[PDB]
Amino acid sequence: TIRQNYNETSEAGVNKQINLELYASYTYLSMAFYFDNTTVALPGAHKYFKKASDEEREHAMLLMKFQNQRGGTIVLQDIKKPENDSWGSLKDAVQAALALEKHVNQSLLDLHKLADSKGDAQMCDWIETHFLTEQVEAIKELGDHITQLTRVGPGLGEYTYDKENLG
Amino acid sequence: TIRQNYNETSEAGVNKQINLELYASYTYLSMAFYFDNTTVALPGAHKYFKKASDEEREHAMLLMKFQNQRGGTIVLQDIKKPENDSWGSLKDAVQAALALEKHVNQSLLDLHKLADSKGDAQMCDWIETHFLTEQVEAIKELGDHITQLTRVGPGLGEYTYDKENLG
Amino acid sequence: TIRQNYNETSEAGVNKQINLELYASYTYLSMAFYFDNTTVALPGAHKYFKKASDEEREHAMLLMKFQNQRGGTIVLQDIKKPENDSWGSLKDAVQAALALEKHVNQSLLDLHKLADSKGDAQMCDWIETHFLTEQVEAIKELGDHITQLTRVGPGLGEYTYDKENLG
Amino acid sequence: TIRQNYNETSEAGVNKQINLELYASYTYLSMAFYFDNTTVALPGAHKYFKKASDEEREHAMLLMKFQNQRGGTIVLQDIKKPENDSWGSLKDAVQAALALEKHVNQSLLDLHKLADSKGDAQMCDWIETHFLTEQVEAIKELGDHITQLTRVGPGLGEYTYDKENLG
Amino acid sequence: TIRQNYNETSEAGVNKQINLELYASYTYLSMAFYFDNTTVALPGAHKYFKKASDEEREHAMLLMKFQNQRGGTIVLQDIKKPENDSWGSLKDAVQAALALEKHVNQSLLDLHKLADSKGDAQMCDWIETHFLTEQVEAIKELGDHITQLTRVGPGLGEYTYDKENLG
Amino acid sequence: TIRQNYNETSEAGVNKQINLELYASYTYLSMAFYFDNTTVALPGAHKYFKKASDEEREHAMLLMKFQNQRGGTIVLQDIKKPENDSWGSLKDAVQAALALEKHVNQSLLDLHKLADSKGDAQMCDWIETHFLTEQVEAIKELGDHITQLTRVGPGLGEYTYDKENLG
Amino acid sequence: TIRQNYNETSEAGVNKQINLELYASYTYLSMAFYFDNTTVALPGAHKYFKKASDEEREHAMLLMKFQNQRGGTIVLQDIKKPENDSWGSLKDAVQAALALEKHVNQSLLDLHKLADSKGDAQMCDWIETHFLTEQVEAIKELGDHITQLTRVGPGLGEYTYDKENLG
């Protein structure tokens, strides 16, 4: 028996977070191959969102590893398909990415609060170490991308930011 | 318009195969982190099924690429959770993997037969090139693993085959 | 006598394909040096279409090699001059290239169907191996170029895509 | 006067933890040389617990350094002899190691909770940075070893795990 | 049970092809050591047909591997001795080699047609990948050797071609 | 909008800490060039406090970065001149440095307590990660320097400690 | 307007020479793959005439470049198929090559005389620099090959000269 100071509600919250990271991974996968579609043809955004999809899947696997380390049980659920089939302009897709990452961030802060209320000091620091600052940096980066995509405008500007920044 | 000799039924079959490969990826992820649970503790199988998950996700992404190359439209669906939460012995899990890969193979052979019925010579060769022989080799490897896992037996044999072969 | 399972209609079709690959080579040669003309002055497109002309000539020579390998007789015909003397905007030229490659692709699929109907298993696989997937990738690339050339627009955008992508 | 925001109960708790880490070091030293005894003769376990003894002495020294950093005073007490003179089977010893590390983990969580109740933000973070996650990983590793030692069984299994994993 | 979409007539055909490849290996071994005989003394042909014998044994082993991969059973038969004890001139032996490889090519095309009639897409592709184009190239090479051996003529020509081309 | 879980009082406290770190930077610059004055002439202390000034300016810039990352607004104020024009003995200056760093530490602990009262888990961890332990180590080092400067005494000792330790 | 001292008759003569060089390229391609036919089987001549084809295509492209550099307009015409389908002996083919190169040389000398009659000093030097001496050296080499092919004779000599000189 390795389980120690690990509440069953914290365990359920970790299972929930696993599914949300997988959901995010699959949303970015959808975004990546939308930009690979020949009617869209933005190869930098294809690469950028494919990497984001890999990173979110890494996040899901960090949480599954944590679930095992603390002596919980991983319980998987369906991965819901992304909210959209097509994602509009490059700026639209980055705006939807920012919305998703803020939603993931709120869920991580709720998970942290839950852990804190059960006195789970190791879990709180683990979430801070691997997630909370990473999420703040990702949100800042996407916000910067949105301001730049606004500045450069549609057409030539979108092509340029795709190739010179996202690629 | 890049689409040429690409049937709408073939396109839908590719979208079905994308979902099936993702389901396989998620089943192997489940298996991998089952073997990371402290009550199972088989690190070779954890590494082996984690790589199998990565490979099936690559398979899904090859099909997404092909969908775009031929001028179809990727349509994603929910990724259903794996059939089990826990996977029993190492032999049980390899047996479950064999059954899944044979299911995926029958799906690929049906997709090949469909593409052939619509005269899609490039699609047929593409499935042969990337999938049909890879699948036969995967099934042969899994069957060999099952025979070796039967030979070495439970207990010390399972530990040994996990570490010396799968890891 | 090396000839075996090689139908005389398949042989005629290979001679036809040789001439069409040479025709394509000469159309891309025309395109390349149109963009070298001082009133056009797009050096990236000059390079890009000169390479395409070399590649189509390589294709013609692969087919002549195949004709000899199977024991047929190469019969050459006039290479018709390209359809146009000048090719308009960079987007116009890439659109004409896409139209030509789809026409070449349809001819390759007809050649494959002909071979299949005569039971020429080696010829079918040879066409799949060297041509059918290459043609799908070339058609996808040109379609992507057209979407990007539309996105970036005339003037500065055309200059930029010429230098940063086609060059 | 460097002392700042450092409670004297926190300071007394750090002194208690120093003694517990030294007690753990000395328990693992006992175990290590039990496995070096000719009637036991498990060289992998000897090396593994010798390293564990070194690491626990490092932990004690980290806490002594921290006591000095915060302007407290180190106060040493007798290091109690280990609970047993001989440690049974390899599995028996890893089970006693797991019990000990859970006791040390509970002590660390109590020390953290004490620091938190006195508003010692830096001491809380220091315990998280150096101990809490290290302790969770050590406990998971020991649990995994117990599961594998059960799987391989006595005799040849014990010999094999000792040589191939612990050593 | 790894067997899937593998017809027992296909399996019996693979066993037949194994024996034919072994028969070809043994014919080329005969030829190779005929040219090593002191009354013949053509060292280039000795090396060339020894290599051909090795390659045909490799072909047999590829087919045995395939039989196992698809879940069939290898069934071996006597390897018949070669049709002749001595092989005449160098040109004579290359002519007999050409006749043999055309017979093997017809066997491979029949095996492919059989697999195709049972819907064995993977077996058809496997034969194309490993045999059909290799066989066309081997036949072209042998035909070219016969033409050059005719051109150089008997005596000094035979000596020269043996040393400079076959060797 | 990137701002999430970032309280306006926390934001104002970060602007206060930016100014305080800049004040510390400027105090250390004053000290550094006091020790460069020909009537003082302690080159080790000049180098030591110049680096301390660089480090506190880096601290201010880390907080400016954090303000932007969380979606706050940097608001700068006057940097007040240091408390003294001349700093007495080397021991006097290290004593003045210790008092300043303890003041900065109390400011950081108050900022941490404020962020904690508003549930800002990421800010709390960020202050722990970048400041709280760095501050404890800085205070410990300064206290040690003061004890050594007392031990070595004025005159030759001050010269020696300046050159051999601070420089 | 870059055009200067470039006569319209000279421009038309350059367009005529572009077509003639392309006709030569295609004649050499025909010859090259005649020698690759299994009933001819001379690999040195295949390589030699394939390179000659590449070189004449380079010649055409040099003239296209020159047309653009001087501010003319490239106008392409049909490339007539070669005069023969089969080229007889190796000596016959080199003899046909010599006659073609002398025809091309007379065309170049006529183009030079025309440029000279219009006072086009740069064009005259350009034809001298790139063509007139290259042509004399090509004709000398072909004449030497014909004398050597006469010396070595049919049969073994033709094989030897093909391999040792042309290849």
Query: What's at C64, amino acid-wise?
Result: M
Q: Is D56 annotated as a binding residue?
A: yes
- C130: enclosing H helix or E strand: none
Distance CA D153, CA B160 (A): 12
Whole-Å CA distances, F142 to C117, D2, D71, F26, F50: 90, 9, 12, 18, 15
CB contacts, 8 Å: F119 with chain A:
109, 113
Radius of gyration, alpha carbons of chain F: 18
Residue G104 burial by Cβ neighbours in a 10 Å radius (0-12, 13-18, 19+): buried
Beta-carbon separation of G81 and C76 below 8 A: yes
Asked whether C75 and C14 are in contact (CB, 8 A), the reply is no
Asked whether B153 and B146 are in contact (CB, 8 A), the reply is no
Query: Of E84, E82, E96, nearest to E45 (Cα)?
Result: E96
Distance CA C114, CA C3 (A): 18
DSSP state of E153: -
Query: What's at B73, amino acid-wise?
Result: T
Three-state DSSP state, A76: coil
Handedness of CA G35, G41, G47, G48 (dihedral sign): negative
Tokens of F100: 């300043």
Check contact D-G (3+ Cβ pairs < 8 Å): no
DSSP string for E38-96: TTT--HHHHHHHHHHHHHHHHHHHHHHHHHHHTT--------PPPS-S---SHHHHHHH
Residue corresponding to tokens 């057209």: C146
Three-state DSSP state, A79: strand
Asked whether G34 and G87 are in contact (CB, 8 A), the reply is yes
Tokens of C33: 């040096």
Residue corresponding to tokens 């001298």: G128
CA distance D60 to chain F (A): 19
- D71 conformational bin, left if phi > 0, alpha if psi -120 to 50, beta if neither: left
Asked whether B20 and B107 are in contact (CB, 8 A), the reply is yes
Q: Cα A17 to the chain's mean position, in Å?
A: 10
Residues in chain A: 167
DSSP string for B70-127: TT-------BPPPS-S---SHHHHHHHHHHHHHHHHHHHHHHHHHHHHTT-HHHHHHH
Whole-Å CA distances, D163 to D1, D48, D53, D159, D167: 53, 10, 19, 6, 5
Cβ within 8 Å of residue C50, ≥6 positions away: C28, C29, C32, G61
Tokens of D124: 């809380």
Query: What's at B74, amino acid-wise?
Result: I
Distance CA C149, CA C161 (A): 7
Q: Is A83 annotated as a binding residue?
A: no
Which subunits count as partners of chain C given 3+ CB pairs below 8 Å?
A, B, E, G
Three-state DSSP state, D28: helix
- B37 conformational bin, left if phi > 0, alpha if psi -120 to 50, beta if neither: beta
Beta-carbon separation of F4 and A102 below 8 A: yes
Whole-Å CA distances, C89 to A87, C93, C103, F86: 30, 6, 21, 74
Asked whether A63 and A21 are in contact (CB, 8 A), the reply is yes
Return the residue in B95, B100, B139 with the most chain E beta carbons within 10 A, the one to mutate for interface testing. B139
Distance CA D31, CA D44 (A): 12
Virtual torsion, Cα D115, D118, D121, D123, nearest 10 deg: -30
Distance CA E4, CA D158 (A): 42
Residue C137 burial by Cβ neighbours in a 10 Å radius (0-12, 13-18, 19+): exposed
Cβ within 8 Å of residue E51, ≥6 positions away: none
- E146: enclosing H helix or E strand: helix E133-152
Tokens of F74: 């940097």
Residue C79 bridge partners (DSSP):
G79
Asked whether B29 and B79 are in contact (CB, 8 A), the reply is no
Out of F112, F128, F139, the one facing D2 most closely (by C-beta) is F139
Neighbour tally for D62: CB within 10 Å:
16
Handedness of CA A126, A127, A131, A133 (dihedral sign): negative
User: For residues C74-113, b (16+ Cβ closer than 10 Å) or e, as one string?
Assistant: bbbeebbbbeeeebeebbebbbbbbebbbebbebbbebbe
Out of C112, C127, C137, the one facing B69 most closely (by C-beta) is C137
Tokens of E110: 């029949």
CB contacts, 8 Å: D129 with chain A:
125
Handedness of CA E64, E66, E67, E69 (dihedral sign): positive
Asked whether G98 and G142 are in contact (CB, 8 A), the reply is yes
Q: What is the count of residue pairs from A and B with beta carbons less than 8 Å apart?
A: 75
Out of B125, B128, B143, the one facing E2 most closely (by C-beta) is B143
CA distance C114 to chain G (A): 23
List the helix and strand counts (H, then E) for chain C: 6, 0
Residue corresponding to tokens 């025709």: C23
Asked whether A91 and A150 are in contact (CB, 8 A), the reply is yes
Radius of gyration, alpha carbons of chain G: 18
Residue A79 bridge partners (DSSP):
B79
Least CA distance to B38: which residue of chain D?
Answer: D144
